[PDB]
Amino acid sequence: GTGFPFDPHYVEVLGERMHYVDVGPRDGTPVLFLHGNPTSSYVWRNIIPHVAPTHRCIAPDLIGMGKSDKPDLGYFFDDHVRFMDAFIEALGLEEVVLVIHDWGSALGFHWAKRNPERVKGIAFMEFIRPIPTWDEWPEFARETFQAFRTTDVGRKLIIDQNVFIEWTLPMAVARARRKWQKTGHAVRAIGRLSSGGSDQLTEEQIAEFKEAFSLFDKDGDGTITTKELGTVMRSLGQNPTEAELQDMINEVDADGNGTIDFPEFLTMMARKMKDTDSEEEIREAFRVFDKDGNGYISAAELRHVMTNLGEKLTDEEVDEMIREADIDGDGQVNYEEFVQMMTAKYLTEVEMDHYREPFLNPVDREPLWRFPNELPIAGEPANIVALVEEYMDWLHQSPVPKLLFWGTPGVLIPPAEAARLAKSLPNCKAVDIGPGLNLLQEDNPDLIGSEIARWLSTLEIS
């Protein structure tokens, strides 16, 4: 679902105008959806239609974000508190049910603690809590977010280069697709080793092939040798000769040095060909995954090809790859599911353009940089850590009905953390949404929407 059909509404807030969705019946307790960084009310576009048939749904765009006004603010968390506090009063919301995500959940939890009699329920997912150590932060994103949290490299990355929109955001949905594509690329690379010229690749295409290259360059020295290619080719069951290995390398060895460096690998992976020969490569990769040739990639078959390509996947990681690929839910992966995994990103271009639209001007990207610099990680910043600790204490002692959504591996909320909270929060039901990183609304909106609407029917609301 890529559209945003909701009539735009605006309300005057501290001398600015804030945009919000307002759908559903007018009467009854309103359900307030709060988005986080770097999204907008667009993040709820596929959740709200499950709830709007029977409830008023209000989804603001944070100040400086979405379609809301963009004043010259520092956009600290306490800036957002001011505007969200005033937004709630401006709409005259006496009682609410909160549905909150990432920085929207800090907003909602902090507001609920201070107005506990005005909150009849809280549904939350991938929410802000104190991250005790950088060890609890996904390894693959540790370096980048540490770099985000500086005024020189972080601002150049986020503000000057729009990396948080163009890179972080499409990488914050889920993870299995990176592994499918890395191994599909390596399988197509094997084939290409065994039309006319090559494309010049974008910087985004080049990095996608960087992971695939690492599978062959076992020792990481930047070149693929006779012995490295033979190791790979060995595990796959296509066992060939040192003469075969050299001739294969020689066809791609532009500089004649006997090894394949990353630029030569790129030129092979950028070869031009008709679309139908591109399709034949993907059909051939599917047949490699589909060992018994019955038309479905089983979990056991996936384990074999992943090992034969040099991965060492836990059972949880295998299950994750299947479940992300399994559109029709039969526990296996047919050719159509394979194709989508290999050739599509988590967010369509139409979906990226909606997320991009508020931030086309670099001078408008301040909240994109300030937000990761506010994240409570390893005790910094200490005021944010203190504030979040206070509402987590409130949350542990409060009888408010709570609904927790979580995925694997998560980002803010690891599965083990979700387990802890599911047991220690009072009157809390927890729902496993399946695979996901931070944007769980882009992983399983139907379950989240369905479950929120069933949960609402049990509350003391009208």
Ligand SMILES: CCCCCCOCCOCCNC(=O)c1ccc(C(=O)O)c(C2=C3CC=C(N4[C@@H]5CC[C@H]4COC5)C=C3Oc3cc(N4[C@@H]5CC[C@H]4COC5)ccc32)c1
């Ligand atoms: C509630 C919070 C919500 C949480 C949601 C997030 O949850 C997980 C999602 O993912 C986490 C984020 N990971 C990434 O964003 C992510 C993933 C892969 C890459 C990669 O380069 O391969 C990068 C990029 C990085 C990464 C690390 C850098 N370092 C090094 C050395 C210097 C610096 C300081 O330290 C060590 C510098 C980078 O420079 C980049 C410049 C550009 N560009 C654009 C335009 C020009 C320029 C060049 O080419 C296109 C594009 C990308 C990157 C970012």
Ligand SMILES: [Ca+2]
């Ligand atoms: Ca090497």
Ligand SMILES: [Ca+2]
């Ligand atoms: Ca070479």
Ligand SMILES: [Ca+2]
């Ligand atoms: Ca099979």
Ligand SMILES: [Ca+2]
């Ligand atoms: Ca299937």
Ligand SMILES: [Cl-]
């Ligand atoms: Cl953030």
